[PDB]
């Protein structure tokens, strides 16, 4: 479930609005490249190098991410001065390296090679003013839903407190949100750092309130969060309909996709090895007769047909269109209710899971649906329904079962099978098997293996089991891997593909504790169970 601030327009289909509207955001990265940013403690990396890695991580994520979010880069503490607010004695040592543009591999290359640490020091509040100017002068031309400014500094240098009021007023009026990234966590700094921090705290509290303090981060924690590529998130379209029980009882509902086999939309384009262009490639599907000598046929001589066993039945798309089974349309009709035990999870069908809630802002529908949910739960029963997406989609038979959690209640819909899709095959029994019955010792070895390899932990004092390996929290490694490679080929075209990153392997493997515990039991199993290839 989403936060209360996340509006429902994001889930509704409208002409270039809602899900179809561009969630474009303007982001200005305000980096401190001043002399002090290079000074470091023997054991840890310099703030400059730490902030540089955070920015690289951010930009890399954005380059592969679907979002059309635009990024600008302001540097302060640089030797030279190049900004629109440049005066003879004003906004000195502040450089606008990049103006608000979609991120690209040229930006990443500059961040990694062109950008160098400065020898001077600049006012961080002046840098923020220059950053605000970038947003103020460049958001006019395009449509941006959000405007952000991220400041990366060590708060080591002196600054003027004279522009605080104009800074706060412009951020509020322009609806620009702020975030600070420092070499230290908020929850052995110099006295200047203590002064700078108090002002940063005041600024954040003025803008965000009590929660403002939560928007102050360490480069260390920022690097930890941004090390992985963006997890694919899409807003499910709200599906309006009426849950019908007979023809006299109707319940207004809104359904949304909860589970999907998520994929990246952009795929591989086949191009000529020389021109590297798509236009140079063309596919032509030719037709020839089953009989000898391969007799070609022209498109003006081919008709549509279907096989009915040994019979070949000509059936045009026109005739098929009219004789075709035609559904009444969108529906979610209850056929009846049965024991949940009569619906086995091995029979679950389809490529989606639907969560069904009452129609948006409808209390009457909410109470009505809550009655159904709790009755089914209290009776340990489920609903068997007829589901049809629209007038075109093939109707489905499925299960709608209760889902009662804290802060939300709903019905979960999953398709059930038709008689025509059920192959029961009849498998040999293994219990009756006098040949493959395991010995007492073999059973005890497996018993010991299962206990050692447990992926859960009890006695949390809440009578709740703690999962040691939560797979559903892990992002699909194929995307992470693809992006790593796509990035590698972009920055290093002559180099071969890199090997899989260790953290990826680390997240796909169970805790080292589980692996260690199992060693002895696994050894006992290898000796007790003879295994050999035929």
């Amino acid at each position: 479930m989403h936060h209360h601030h996340h509006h429902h327009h994001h889930h509704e289909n409208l002409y270039f609005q809602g899900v179809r509207s561009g969630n474009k955001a303007a982001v200005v990265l305000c980096m401190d490249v001043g002399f002090t940013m290079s000074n470091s403690i023997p054991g840890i990396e310099s703030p400059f190098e730490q902030a540089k890695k955070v920015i690289t991580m951010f930009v890399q994520r954005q380059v592969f991410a679907e979002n059309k979010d635009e990024i600008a880069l302001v540097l302060f503490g640089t030797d030279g001065t190049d900004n629109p607010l440049s005066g003879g004695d004003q906004y000195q040592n502040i450089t606008v390296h990049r103006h608000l543009m979609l991120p690209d591999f040229d930006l990443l290359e500059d961040i990694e090679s062109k950008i160098q640490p400065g020898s001077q020091q600049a006012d961080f509040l002046d840098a923020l003013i220059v950053s605000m100017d970038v947003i103020q002068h460049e958001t006019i031309g395009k449509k941006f839903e959000k405007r952000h400014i991220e400041i990366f500094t060590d708060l080591s240098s002196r600054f003027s407190k004279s522009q605080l009021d104009i800074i706060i007023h412009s951020l509020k009026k322009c609806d620009i949100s702020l975030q600070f990234f420092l070499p230290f966590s908020l929850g052995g700094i110099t006295e200047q750092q203590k002064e700078g921090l108090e002002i940063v705290k005041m600024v954040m509290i003025s803008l965000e309130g009590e929660d403002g303090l939560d928007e102050i981060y360490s480069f260390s924690e920022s690097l930890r969060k941004l090390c992985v590529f963006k997890k694919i998130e899409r807003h499910s379209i709200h599906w309006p309909c009426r849950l019908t029980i007979g023809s006299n009882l109707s319940i207004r509902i809104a359904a949304y996709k909860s589970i999907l086999q998520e994929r990246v939309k952009k795929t591989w384009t086949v191009v000529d090895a020389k021109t590297l262009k798509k236009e140079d490639i063309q596919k032509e599907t030719v037709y020839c007769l089953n009989d000898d000598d391969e007799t070609e046929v022209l498109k003006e001589d081919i008709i549509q047909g279907f096989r009915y066993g040994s019979d070949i039945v000509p059936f045009s798309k026109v005739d098929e269109e009219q004789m075709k089974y035609k559904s009444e349309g969108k529906c979610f009709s209850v056929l009846g209710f049965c024991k949940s035990s009569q619906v086995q999870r091995r029979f679950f069908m389809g490529n989606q899971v639907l969560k069904v809630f009452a129609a948006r802002d409808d209390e009457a529908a909410a109470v009505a649906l809550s009655s159904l949910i709790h009755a089914l739960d209290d009776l340990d029963m489920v609903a068997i329904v007829r589901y049809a997406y629209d007038k075109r989609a093939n109707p489905q038979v499925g299960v709608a079962f209760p889902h009662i959690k804290h802060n939300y209640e709903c019905l979960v819909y999953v398709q059930l099978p038709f008689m025509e899709d059920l192959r029961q095959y009849m498998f040999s029994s293994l219990k009756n098997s006098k040949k493959y019955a395991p010995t007492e010792a073999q059973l005890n070895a497996v018993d010991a293996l299962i206990d050692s390899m447990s992926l859960a932990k009890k006695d949390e004092k809440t009578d709740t089991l703690e999962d040691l390996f939560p797979t559903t929290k892990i992002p699909n490694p194929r995307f992470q891997r693809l992006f790593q490679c796509l990035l590698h080929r972009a920055l290093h075209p002559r180099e071969p593909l890199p090997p899989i990153q260790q953290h990826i392997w680390n997240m796909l493997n169970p805790p080292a504790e589980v692996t260690t515990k199992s060693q002895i039991p696994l050894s006992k199993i290898k000796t007790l169970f003879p295994l050999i290839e035929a």
Partner: peptide
């Protein structure tokens, strides 16, 4: 909900 650099 995660904002800015994290979003």
């Amino acid at each position: 909900k995660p904002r800015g650099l994290f979003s």
